[PDB]
Amino acid sequence: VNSFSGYLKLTDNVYIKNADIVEEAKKVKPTVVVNAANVYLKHGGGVAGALNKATNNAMQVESDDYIATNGPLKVGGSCVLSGHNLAKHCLHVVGPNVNKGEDIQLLKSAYENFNQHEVLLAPLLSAGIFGADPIHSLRVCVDTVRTNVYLAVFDKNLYDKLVSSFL
Numbered sequence: 001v002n003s004f005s006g007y008l009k010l011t012d013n014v015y016i017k018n019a020d021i022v023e024e025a026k027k028v029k030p031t032v033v034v035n036a037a038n039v040y041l042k043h044g045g046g047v048a049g050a051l052n053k054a055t056n057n058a059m060q061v062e063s064d065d066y067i068a069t070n071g072p073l074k075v076g077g078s079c080v081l082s083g084h085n086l087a088k089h090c091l092h093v094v095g096p097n098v099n100k101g102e103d104i105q106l107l108k109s110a111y112e113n114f115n116q117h118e119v120l121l122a123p124l125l126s127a128g129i130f131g132a133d134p135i136h137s138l139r140v141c142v143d144t145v146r147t148n149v150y151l152a153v154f155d156k157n158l159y160d161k162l163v164s165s166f167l
């Protein structure tokens with residue numbers, strides 16, 4: 001038993017809620033919150049800008065040190081950093097950004113990173129301003145992630161569409 005509230009069950013291992021992921025993180029303090037990052041960990045907008053703002057820019061400061069030491073991530077890759085005031089850890093996961101012309105085929109690889117963690121609070125990878133089809137992304141999530149994932153969807157209309165179309 002865990003401490004997430006009001007989530008809708010989709011499969012053996014995936015739940016979903018129309019909620020602000022920052023507020024879900026501040027309430028639950030999960031072991032892992034997932035960020036929808038880019039390879040440079042430049043947290044400008046979307047999930048990343050929202051999470052980083054909630055950390056008072058501490059996420060960005062930590063991320064800049066990470067990049068200075070290690071270089072950029074791969075599209076499809078991830079790194080574990082601090083969750084700051086939001087979670088124990090933040091799993092920064094790079095899905096493909098279709099508005100950058102990146103390969104949507106790497107979405108499955110991106111979701112595979114979730115399998116290294118027993119329980120995660122996460123956004124829908126590559127959706128929103130990342131420009132991929134959100135129905136497709138939820139499908140890839142359910143067909144790839146085997147650990148327990150709690151998906152938080154900001155946009156109400158998107159949430160309603162995702163639930164009503166889910167197979």
Ligand SMILES: O=C(O)C[C@H](NC(=O)c1ncnc2[nH]ccc12)c1ccc(F)cc1
Pocket residue numbers: 020021022036045046047050123124125126127128129130152153154155158
């Ligand atoms: O769930 C959604 O609507 C889409 C989601 N966006 C957000 O979660 C979001 N965007 C802007 N400001 C925000 N503030 C608090 C949350 C938040 C998203 C998912 C994958 C991405 F690669 C990029 C965005």
